Amino acid sequence: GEPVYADAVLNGWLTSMGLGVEYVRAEGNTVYYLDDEGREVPVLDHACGFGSLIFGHNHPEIIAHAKAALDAGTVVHAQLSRQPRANQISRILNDIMRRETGRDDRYNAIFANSGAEANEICMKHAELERQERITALFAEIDAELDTAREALTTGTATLDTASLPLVGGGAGDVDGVIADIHRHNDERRAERPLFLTLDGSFHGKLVPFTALSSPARFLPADEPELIGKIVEDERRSVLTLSLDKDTVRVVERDFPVVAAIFVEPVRGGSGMKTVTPELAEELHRLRDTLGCPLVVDEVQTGIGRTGAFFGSALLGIRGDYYTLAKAIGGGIVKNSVALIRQDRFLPAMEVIHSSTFAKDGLSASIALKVLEMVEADGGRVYQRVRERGQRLEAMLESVRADHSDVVSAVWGTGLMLALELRDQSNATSQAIREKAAHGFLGYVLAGFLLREHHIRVLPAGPRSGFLRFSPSLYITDEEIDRTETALRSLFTALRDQDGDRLVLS
Amino acid sequence: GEPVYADAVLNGWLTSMGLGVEYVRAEGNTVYYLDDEGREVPVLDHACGFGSLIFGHNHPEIIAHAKAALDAGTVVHAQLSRQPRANQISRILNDIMRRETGRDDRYNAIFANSGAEANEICMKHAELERQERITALFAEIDAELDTAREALTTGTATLDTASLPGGAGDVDGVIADIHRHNDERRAERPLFLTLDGSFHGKLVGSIQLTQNEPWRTPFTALSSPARFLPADEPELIGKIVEDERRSVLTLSLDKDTVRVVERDFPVVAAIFVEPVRGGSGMKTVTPELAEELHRLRDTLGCPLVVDEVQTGIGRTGAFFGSALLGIRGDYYTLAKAIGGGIVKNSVALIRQDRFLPAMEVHSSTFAKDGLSASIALKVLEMVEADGGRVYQRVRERGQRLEAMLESVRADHSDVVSAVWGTGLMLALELRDQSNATSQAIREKAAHGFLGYVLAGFLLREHHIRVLPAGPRSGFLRFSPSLYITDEEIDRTETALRSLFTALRDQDGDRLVLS
Ligand SMILES: [Cl-]
Ligand SMILES: [Cl-]
Ligand SMILES: [Cl-]
Ligand SMILES: [Cl-]
């Protein structure tokens, strides 16, 4: 019971999973810990900052660039001055998306410190768009009411009394029905925006903390045919008086309820599942139907990792807004960006977002270096990601084939891959069964891989039911062979229900 | 109409304010831009990343440490492994607060990437505490309902007060109505109280990059409800909070009578206070306000969250502004200066006897990174060196800067209303210029841009970088490094006397670019 100042519960839980190690150095695909003699033990890193390290730990070019930037006296803090590097970064991202989608679309960039903050920038801009739509709708309703009033206070038109139940609340005189319409409409306008998201994703603030964020409706990614009815149930109306020749009727007008649709091209939280063509088509339909933006959240993938810069370009997701974070800090610094199609972009938004660290000089310099590296030699790097990915996936598919009793599937694309583990909650071995019941099986399997094979793997998905494989593009054939050996060993032990060997006492 | 990919509105606005410059290099208190010949023009920086650069731009010790850390192959990304530097950083902050407050209290640390994210961690942990309180209250109401039912199906009568839910008066029906009334209260979102806080100011959209409009709250529907308490009028705060009281219902058994009665519900998740309010022009918490917040915290049972992310460690003349001003918080947030002016790091400190350990086990890939952790340990070594000499330096430099600003205020009280702040976190309040005789000045004041126009004059004419704060850019900030020289403070004095003479003379031609 000695004083602790951080991580006592984290460190105790890591120790029980077999993941209580301290890494003291890292280079490429290798992290090192110290044995009891204090020698560096190399460990192969398949987590790689959850796919941030597409160039690996501490890439010599990124390290040399960061030191050159510091040696130049780069202005890190230049808030409310001209920083041309923001526009240079955005120009490159615009050119890359134009090439990958074949669409001549232009995007404004707003920079931030984390994936969640870039996603939050999109929630704010989306809510300013919804408010512009509400303003336009309410101006039109105001004009419709004044035309209807001027006709009902002269010869011009009948107020059709059969229309009055749509307001419901006494009044039968003109000024009274209109007062009740204003009140009904003011209530709808007071309601919080709705965000549409997919089961297995979170987007910054969007998901015991429901009460901290805007309402979200979670849609089933696996059943795009169910999505239509779910969203149809969120329809709401405001009221107006419509003059049709000689007749005023009270009518329903659709209200902008939904501020935005969020989608990740690859859902880490679903075990590295990619958006299907069917789902992409349903989100396109939703976006076209609601008039809200489709926000494509790529902050959790890592630029280039799917085999294209934009996973969305690869999967044909036609977004209005895009977010990036992972890999743009070169595995040393923190940067994120919201890209908002210029024909939707509200100029006000450029001077709304206020963050001290955002758009800093150091991470801007590092981002321009990363974009040079990822674009070098006519896009060879994307070719390498695709070739390394095919090799890694073939190995995982080969392990799945011989171990289908405990591995259900291979998921993902490029160098963003996972194995799905079959449920072990009915396991023979008490120690395995108990860990599976608490949702920790993936963590204990990862512990085995560390202690017996010196391989760093971390789980993904609900109840640690998947193993992530997201190494750098420098992963060697030999490193993939050692991983295969480690997984055959792991899945044999799990097949044989060896709880003594897999779960630490 | 050439294609532009970022900053077209920002850059156009900066140009019109006289602030359209690109700084290409920085060291200490100096940023450099290029003249038309491409030679470096030195500019004195009183903004210093809004007070982040307590050690100035690119401090040689911090730069040398950061390069050594990169050369050593520091593990930046080690998520779900042992990272003892987090515990080492927390231990130092714990020891510093112990020394500055004299209280032997312990705090758990949770790291994030920005001041806003450290503040958000406090909102989350506060809301877990409120839910524990709700659980305990509802357990007690459950037992009170079971006692009341068992007595009303034996020997006791219910009194009239069915009003508070008031139909049939039968046992199962009154209880059903109580469950329903209580389920509604329990569904309500938490309320946050803030003392004109910059955190909730930014969250609701009142505080923006280039303006502060308390009347403009476009994003309230994206966040938990916030009630803004008037920091200037602590005597009004009690009644405002009294009006936020809400009740759940229970059955109270007294001898042979069961009555429906109201019990207090935990409405408020947390109280947020900044020791120095940047957004209100560097105003410090008064003893009277501190006492009112202590009372509120003790009365509500919610944490007092002390947000120091916008101050900068050491800048008030103590490490913790809260220690200096006697604010006894439950949670504390830091960000500015802990990244050494080169990287991004923030920390939430939560009193260990309130701390819910769930809170520390994934929020953010970048959080608790190895590089910013190494740099934070270097900054803490630097700020603590030589028996706290650096806090002594901040206090001495601050006193010199404040005396200069007070002497400018004295001779220019027609256009400068006050000096605010403490240590090297200072501001001048400008009087409103909405009635200015100069049309060019009056128009800029009507758009809330007076402070930015004045800052443009200081850049153009005196090569001094100042940035305004507060509603209608009505304050000028002074937050340089502790290395600011006597001659740099003299040049600033000269620049301000020149500026306020031109404003006195309503010289719109000189102050506002055509
Ligand atoms: Cl280390
Ligand atoms: Cl990165
Ligand atoms: Cl470059
Ligand atoms: Cl900093």
Author numbering:
A (entry chain A): 6 to 212, 226 to 523
B (entry chain B): 6 to 170, 174 to 369, 371 to 523
Task: Give passages from the manuscript.
Previously, the biosynthetic pathway of the immunosuppressive agent caerulomycin A (CRM A) from the marine actinomycete Actinoalloteichus cyanogriseus WH1-2216-6 has been identified, and the critical role of the (S)-selective ω-transaminase CrmG in the biosynthesis of CRM A has been reported. CrmG catalyzes amino acceptor caerulomycin M (CRM M) transformation to caerulomycin N (CRM N). Moreover, the activity of CrmG is insensitive to inhibition from ketone α-ketoglutarate or pyruvate.
The crystal structures of the apo form CrmG were determined to resolution 2.10 and 2.85 Å in space group I222 and C2, with one and two dimers in the asymmetric unit, respectively. Interestingly, in the structure of apo CrmG in I222 space group, the two catalytic pockets of CrmG dimer show completely different conformations. One catalytic pocket adopts the conformation similar with that of apo CrmG in C2 space group, in which the catalytic base K344 is exposed to solvent, here we name it “open” pocket; whereas the other catalytic pocket exhibits closed conformation, in which the G213-S232 loop acts like a lid covering on top of the catalytic K344, therefore K344 becomes inaccessible to the solvent. The closed pocket is more ordered than the open pocket. However, in both open and closed apo pockets, the V317-I321 region adopts a more relaxed conformation, and Q318 occupies the position of the aromatic ring of PLP.
